[PDB]
Amino acid sequence: HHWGYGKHNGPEHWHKDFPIAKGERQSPVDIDTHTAKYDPSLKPLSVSYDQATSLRILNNGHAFNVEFDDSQDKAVLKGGPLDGTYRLIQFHFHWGSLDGQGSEHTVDKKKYAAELHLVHWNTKYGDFGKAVQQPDGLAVLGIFLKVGSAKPGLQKVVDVLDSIKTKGKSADFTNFDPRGLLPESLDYWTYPGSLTTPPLLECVTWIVLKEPISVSSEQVLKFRKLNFNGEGEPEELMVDNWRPAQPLKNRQIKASFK
Ligand SMILES: O=C(O)/C=C/c1cccc(OCc2cccc(CC(=O)O)c2)c1
Ligand code: NA
Ligand SMILES: [Zn+2]
Numbered sequence: 001h002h003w004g005y006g007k008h009n010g011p012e013h014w015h016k017d018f019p020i021a022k023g024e025r026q027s028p029v030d031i032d033t034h035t036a037k038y039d040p041s042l043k044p045l046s047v048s049y050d051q052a053t054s055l056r057i058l059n060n061g062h063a064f065n066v067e068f069d070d071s072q073d074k075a076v077l078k079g080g081p082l083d084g085t086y087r088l089i090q091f092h093f094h095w096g097s098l099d100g101q102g103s104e105h106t107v108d109k110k111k112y113a114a115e116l117h118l119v120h121w122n123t124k125y126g127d128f129g130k131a132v133q134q135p136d137g138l139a140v141l142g143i144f145l146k147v148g149s150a151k152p153g154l155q156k157v158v159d160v161l162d163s164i165k166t167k168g169k170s171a172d173f174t175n176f177d178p179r180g181l182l183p184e185s186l187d188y189w190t191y192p193g194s195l196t197t198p199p200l201l202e203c204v205t206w207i208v209l210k211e212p213i214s215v216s217s218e219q220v221l222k223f224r225k226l227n228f229n230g231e232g233e234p235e236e237l238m239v240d241n242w243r244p245a246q247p248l249k250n251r252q253i254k255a256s257f258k
Contacts, residue, residue: 003198004062004228011243018198025202026246027193028104031253036189039254045080045186045207047141052088054176057160061167061228062197063092063241066157066176070121070128075178077120077139080256081190081205086120086139089128091178093117094196095223097239099147102220104196104242105208107144112212113220114145115242116181117196135192137203143183144212151215153180158222167230183211187257196243210257 001017003009015021052075056067067090068075075088095114096102103112118141121131131137145151156176163171187210194202226238 001198005241014198014200018200020194020200020202023194023200023202024249025192025194025251026200027196027204027206028106028243028245029191029193029248029251029253030106030109030245031189031208033108036253036255038258039256042081042190042254042256043079045188045256046076046078047182047186048078049075049088049177049179051075052176052178054173054178056170057157057164057173058170059164059167059226059238061230063094063238064161064164064226065090065092066173066178073123076123077118077141077207080188080207081254082139082207083136085123087123088118088120088178091116091118091181093145093223094242095145095220095239096242097224097237099217099220101240102242103144104245105142105144105206106245112144113147114215114223116143116145116213117141118143118178118181132195132201132203134203136205138195139205139207142206142208143181144209145215145220146212147217147220148214149216150219151181151213153177154213154215154219158219161222161226165225165231166227166233169231181213183209183213185209185211187211187255189253189255191251191253193251
């Protein structure tokens with residue numbers, strides 16, 4: 001599987017190997033803020049990252065993943081639209097070549113410079129691989145990034161990217177606190193969707209925060225120095241690793257806030 005983000009292997013090609021690309025609950029989507037409806041039934045959202053145990057950061061040729069020890073209930077997401085407990089397994093970002101693009105979700109068609117995905121799996125299914133086979137297997141917390149003031153909690157990530165420039169490189173990344181990547185408000189939109197990369201499985205409850213975080217131009221410029229290619233291969237900058245908005249079809253986006 002040689003999927004990627006280029007002209008010949010990018011999102012418009014994915015459906016040939018992954019026909020669910022044209023399915024009924026694909027992600028990302030445009031969030032039309034005027035059509036999203038407040039749902040007074042949503043329970044409070046609970047992000048409990050105090051005992052999070054990061055392990056490693058990996059360039060997988062598509063993005064970089066900060067991985068967590070998910071062998072115990074440490075860092076979990078509960079409440080909101082969710083039933084039960086979802087354990088953090090990894091986070092990663094999608095970003096652009098320019099500050100005007102990079103996010104996967106859009107808000108009233110606005111693209112942000114980047115989008116953070118904190119990926120969690122439903123502990124009722126025992127492991128991530130079983131969870132992705134279920135319609136309620138994953139919860140992905142999505143957070144927009146805009147360019148402005150630096151995000152101090154991001155800088156440790158930024159500073160290790162030089163050591164994982166190319167596809168397949170990993171580095172120790174212990175003691176990283178993902179609480180430093182969250183905005184002040186947990187107001188959110190939620191809808192049922194999919195993974196935004198192959199295999200595009202329709203197993204995700206999306207929770208997209210309304211408040212973006214700000215990162216500096218210098219921080220995102222360092223994301224853009226990463227490579228899609230492996231070591232010793234021709235350089236292809238890791239930029240524009242985002243899937244565009246997909247048809248909403250038979251879905252409603254719910255808001256947690258008035
Ligand atoms: O290597 C293989 O053959 C199968 C890989 C595989 C098999 C099953 C699942 C799966 O999920 C990958 C994943 C995890 C989290 C998020 C996303 C989409 C995104 O970039 O936001 C994709 C990957
Ligand atoms: Na717009
Ligand atoms: Zn993602």
